[PDB]
Design a protein around this ligand. Structure first.
Ligand code: NAD
Ligand code: AKB
Length: 310
């Protein structure tokens, strides 16, 4: 019963989230936005740079937007290579979203990342409330973003919600600017060729989640009654934790492939992140439970990628 805008709509999450929202609420309620207008695209679409407050505001007020799912960002690897761009898009873009929400009395979904954490806090089952001392440019943007969001909630009364997503795995839109991207790439290349060159070492172990779980978590959190929530911008959220070679082994149980490990600069990013996450507060406050383990995710990835390679 509300007009919804999705920023970053053409990216890894947005490709799936826009369709989920159209189905849940109707096509007449969803507006998609990103930098460049796509050909052959069903959802209504408005182009915008998230840093352009004038155009962003216009899209919001001309479409009577009441809820924003804010996915626009620069991710961890692209951001480490261009730190000024990363700050500008992630922090100034978020501030534009928040200022607009305050003007127009909007509800928001503004995600964070497991990149908020650094190596000074536990790597296993990282708690919700530990200090956030990230060692990446992108992680610092996400910490600043959490704090800005929580100011807008407390000071300004804006109902902004967010999740520290783990690495997300999907087949519909292959990622290209992150660090957890190896997991997707490994699926794609295993099925397309039976070989992969992995950009992290074989023991790299990170929190991961299948996209259907991440999308469902997003929608469930957004549907929760506000008074049930003890956290706002920054829920920890968990599903899986595995190493690169463990994923290789799972994939190899379906298709012949062999993986070679050739780390690059993204190792130095991954090394600074936890292995797994304590998401009790999500599970307690709003009933989170993941549904896809590594086996089930692998079946879905491989079946769809095989189809796409026919
Ligand atoms: N594994 C993951 O995918 C993951 C994990 C944790 C957090 N997140 C968070 O989820 C959100 C979406 O991530 P994603 O993986 O879909 O990213 P993505 O890079 O696939 O999509 C982001 C989109 O933002 C757009 N964008 C970039 N700069 C822009 C600008 N100046 N103005 C407007 N649009 C701009 C891009 O064109 C892209 O389509 C981000 O906040 C990200 O930090 C993602
Ligand atoms: C840290 C993440 O979750 C993200 N996919 C990235 O690799 O930037």
């Amino acid at each position: 019963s509300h007009m919804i805008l999705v920023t970053g709509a053409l990216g890894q999450i947005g490709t799936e989230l826009v369709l989920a929202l159209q189905e849940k609420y109707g096509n007449d309620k969803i507006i998609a936005s990103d930098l460049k207008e796509p050909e052959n695209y069903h959802c209504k679409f408005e182009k915008c740079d998230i840093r352009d407050i004038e155009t962003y505001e216009r899209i919001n007020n001309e479409n009577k937007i009441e809820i924003v799912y804010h996915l626009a960002a620069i991710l961890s690897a692209a951001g480490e290579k261009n730190p000024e761009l990363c700050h500008d898009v992630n922090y100034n873009g978020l501030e534009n979203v928040l200022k607009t929400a305050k003007k127009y009395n909007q509800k928001l979904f503004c995600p964070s990342s497991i990149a908020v954490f650094g190596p000074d806090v536990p790597k296993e089952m990282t708690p919700q409330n530990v200090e956030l001392n990230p060692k990446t440019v992108y992680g610092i943007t996400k910490v600043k973003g959490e704090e800005l969001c929580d100011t807008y909630f407390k000071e300004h009364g804006i109902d902004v919600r967010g999740i520290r997503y783990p690495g997300l795995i999907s087949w519909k839109h292959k990622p290209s600017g992150g660090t957890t991207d190896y997991a997707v790439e490994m699926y794609f290349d295993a099925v397309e060729s039976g070989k992969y060159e992995c950009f992290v070492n074989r023991n790299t172990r990170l929190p991961m989640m299948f996209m259907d779980d991440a999308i469902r978590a997003t929608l469930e959190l957004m549907d929760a009654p506000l008074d049930s929530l003890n956290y706002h911008s920054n829920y920890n959220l968990s599903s899986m934790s595995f190493s690169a070679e463990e994923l290789e082994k799972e994939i190899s149980a379906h298709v012949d492939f062999n993986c070679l490990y050739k780390p690059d600069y993204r190792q130095d990013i991954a090394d600074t992140w936890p292995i797994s996450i304590n998401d009790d507060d999500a599970r307690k406050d709003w009933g989170w439970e993941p549904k896809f383990d590594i086996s089930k995710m692998t079946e879905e990835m491989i079946t769809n990628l095989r189809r796409l390679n026919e």
